[PDB]
Amino acid sequence: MEALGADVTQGLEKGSLITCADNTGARELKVISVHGYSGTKNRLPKAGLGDKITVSVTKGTPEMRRQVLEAVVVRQRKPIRRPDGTRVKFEDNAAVIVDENEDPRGTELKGPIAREVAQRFGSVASAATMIV
């Protein structure tokens, strides 16, 4: 993928439960897999800010519940490092549901997003209210 523009310490693994920062009707997402990732023996697959992941809906509306969808990680509690040396961290871990074309399934994003996630997913960004 296109360089992210910052170094990331993945703060999530397969199985982690995160916030769905949108209005798709999904409230909580479970990480199932990480796009393009391949680990090593015994290593739990990890995902962090900027990765595209496959998720299952754990909490939300009946129609959304249990659906296996694609998403993009927009916030994480574990710090990331920007070119100027500063570390950046969020209040929670969150992702936004996305389609085949990486366009947000929802109409609105909830909460801030990392600028780096913009470079990658512009259409996701063109839905963000706050970009930090």
Partner 1 sequence: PQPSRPRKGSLGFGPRKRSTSETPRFNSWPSDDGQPGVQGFAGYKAGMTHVVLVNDEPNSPREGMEETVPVTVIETPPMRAVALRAYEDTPYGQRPLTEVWTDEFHSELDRTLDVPEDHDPDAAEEQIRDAHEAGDLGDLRLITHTVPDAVPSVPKKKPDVMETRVGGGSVSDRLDHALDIVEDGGEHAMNDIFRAGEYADVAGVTKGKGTQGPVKRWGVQKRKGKHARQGWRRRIGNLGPWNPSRVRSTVPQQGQTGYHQRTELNKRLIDIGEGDEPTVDGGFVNYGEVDGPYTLVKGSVPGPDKRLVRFRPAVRPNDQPRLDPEVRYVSNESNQG
Contact between 38 and partner 1 per CB under 8 A: no
Contact between 67 and RNA per CB under 7 A: no
Contact between 33 and Cl ion per CB under 5 A: yes
Q: How far apart are CA 72 and CA 49, in angstroms?
A: 8
CA dist 65 to 2, 32, 56, 84, Å?
Answer: 32, 15, 8, 41
The residue behind tokens 């950046």 is 88
In contact, 74 and 113? CB cutoff 8 Å: yes
The binder of 38, among partner 1, Cl ion, Mg ion, none, by C-beta within 5 to 8 A per type, is none
Beta bridge partners of 68: 56
Near partner 1 by CB under 8 A, which window of 38-46, 90-98, 102-110, 124-132? Answer: 38-46
| Binding map of Mg ion across residues 18-57, x = CB under 5 A, - = no contact | ------------------------x---------------
In contact, 66 and 88? CB cutoff 8 Å: no
Contact between 36 and partner 1 per CB under 8 A: no
Note the residues at the interface with Cl ion (CB under 5 A): 33, 45
Per CB under 5 A, residues contacting Mg ion are 42
